[PDB]
Symmetry: D3
């Protein structure tokens, strides 16, 4: 009965995040998609919007639970009885930062294992920040997002 957490800002959730969480569900019994409540930089979408969007986009995956959190991801994993922390590794990931984070998470909770998954080649060169920057500048990002996220991002930028 292995429980895994998949933390992030998911601002908004992309097809790359869907690809990662789907691979995680095929490996672990229970996956908690954990959304950061209060990131350093103010998010485009509120925590409620981000939770609602991730819930709709993962509804077809029976063993995914979407939950918000504001504490250390290691503390959150300990409270969720999770022994696995999922991180996606795109071709464009900051590997140096992943090593720092994993070694720090191990110092905080040694029994918590950081697991790196690789997304499809299709999502290996995108990020939520690149998608948003393109969208803010009127670029087509439909291909990178679930339908519900595309509709919400269009509505957000219409009134900005």
């Amino acid at each position: 009965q292995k429980r895994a957490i998949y933390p992030g800002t998911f601002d908004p959730i992309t097809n790359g995040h869907i690809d990662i969480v789907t691979r995680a569900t095929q490996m672990f019994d229970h996956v908690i998609l954990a959304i950061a409540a209060s990131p350093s930089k103010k998010p485009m979408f509120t925590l409620e919007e981000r939770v609602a969007l991730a819930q709709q986009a993962t509804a077809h995956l029976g063993n995914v639970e979407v939950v918000g959190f504001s504490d250390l991801m290691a503390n959150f994993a300990r409270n969720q009885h999770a022994t696995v922390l999922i991180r996606g590794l795109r071709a464009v990931a900051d590997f140096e930062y992943e090593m720092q984070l994993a070694h720090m998470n191990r110092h905080l909770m040694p029994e918590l294992e950081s697991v790196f998954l690789m997304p499809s080649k299709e999502w290996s060169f995108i990020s939520s920040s690149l998608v948003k920057e393109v969208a803010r500048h009127q670029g087509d990002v439909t291909h990178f997002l679930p339908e519900n996220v595309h509709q919400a991002l269009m509505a957000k930028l219409a009134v900005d």
Copy 2:
């Protein structure tokens, strides 16, 4: 009749940028040096100052046109009838970011080819941000800039 765009903030234009745009003119019939009107971080020089400086520094290159833009660089390339997008690759470039940008630009305009040029070893370890940071801290940056840019940067920091 190949048309190439060379986009950037050019805040201010450096000898590294001059080196890149010169190599581009030797390869393509028409080069548009495209200056970003409204970057995320407020620039040191206004768009008019940046355009005027780049115009003076490239005047000796007959097939360079200096133009400001505020849209997506792929949209700007499509409107300029350009099929080539020039990016300089210094030894200190963020290659991971270049891959993201190139793959995103290809998604937005598939017929637009991203072309990476390498500057002289002399300019392979500098950037406008490093030059400005050194200049703000009273360091000698004459070697890295065209004469007109050096005079304008001295005048800017005199009144800051």
Copy 3:
């Protein structure tokens, strides 16, 4: 859940032991798979490498050590493994790791490549570096299981 941990393991080091131990804490059964790897011209034969890894992992009840000369994705299919473990130390290896994982996915899409990070203690060593040091009579006891250390001493003697 069955996971495979493939490699040349020429010889198996404390870094490899660290990885396979983390894998056993996550998956029900772990197959430590030793590739014949003749193109790399290994120091130890496949039988020596299998015997050494068996002795070094004996204390881990859910590890099975097996040799193979097959394509690793075919070997993973034949072992009924849906997880392929790879250890990650630094950025340089991460690139070849991406190629291998994308190729393994093309050959077997249901086989998931997972990357584990070793202890800081083993983050700067490799079988190649240990062998190079041992060839120049340097002390490598700290980096190897005891049985591997004695076999490497005997091999270079």
Copy 4:
């Protein structure tokens, strides 16, 4: 404008076809230049590599396939090329690419090295990886032109 696209092309892959196709859309004439490369001990002879690349690029009207054993900058001068094309997949290759481009510039300053990025589809493959998979009887049809796939099958048979 004449551009040269040099390499070992042992064998030519879909990633190489992707690069040379992008080059033809930018330059009037493209020379796909196959280096003898004896130090790498190639799987296919230079004649086989030339024949394979010729058949695989026949549909591209402005590609000329030529073999060479010369210094690539001397070969580019002799082909009246002012552009040298190199494909870029990841960071690790980008370093050796910088050395090669700065050396080529020292030897021929008027020859410009340009870097093109392949499709995401071919961003994780290489001739070496394809050959390694094919040696272990793995399916590599997806990564190669048909004629190259059959020649690689015949070579390993």
Copy 5:
């Protein structure tokens, strides 16, 4: 009689910084641990707090002088009669940035040599920014700091 400067923000000084400065004292006759007075991002600790903390943490090292500075690190090295500039290289260091900085420092003061030291494996994956981010989020960072720094960081976060 070689004099070396070891510059940084030291916000706060960590065991990684102590490891680096200790290695520097074993190599050079006089080491100046140089604390940046006015960094770009506002520091957690004031310059006086940072100086006091670094002084207490290096007191056992007889040939270390802790000094604040607000000018270019190359100008500061020239004024301190230092011909060596120490930079720590952790496994997670931004090497591209280190190359830019070293080449710029060499342009400003060619006789000033940039020297890269490697910390213990124990401190190879941490930074002051990661330690602070973990501490702000109630994580245990005792292991990464000198005792006096741990007490000061606890007091800082108690009133924040």
Copy 6:
């Protein structure tokens, strides 16, 4: 203070001269240590490499050129060196450099590895690239001391 600058120096280049010159401005005595390196199958014998480096560094009064086949940490101990110099050009080398430095520290904790950065002029060359260019009759005079250039010409003749 005694510093050792070890390497294969096959042959010694202007980049190596740049590094050793910076080292002499920092330390009282510098030992340029040439590793036999038989596994790399060097172009020049150890005696040729020692003779060439001696002639190329003669103008630097505090450089001693010595050959060794020993573990570099044992050689540094025997030379009474507490500093080990390594030149740093780019990120790719920085990883192997970290492994080597952490291993050298394990073998000799009082021996400090220091990294120096060469001039921008030599930041894109290596002995391997210079030899490869010279093998194809390319001009490499700019990258080598005069005596090394003539010896490399004579070796390839």
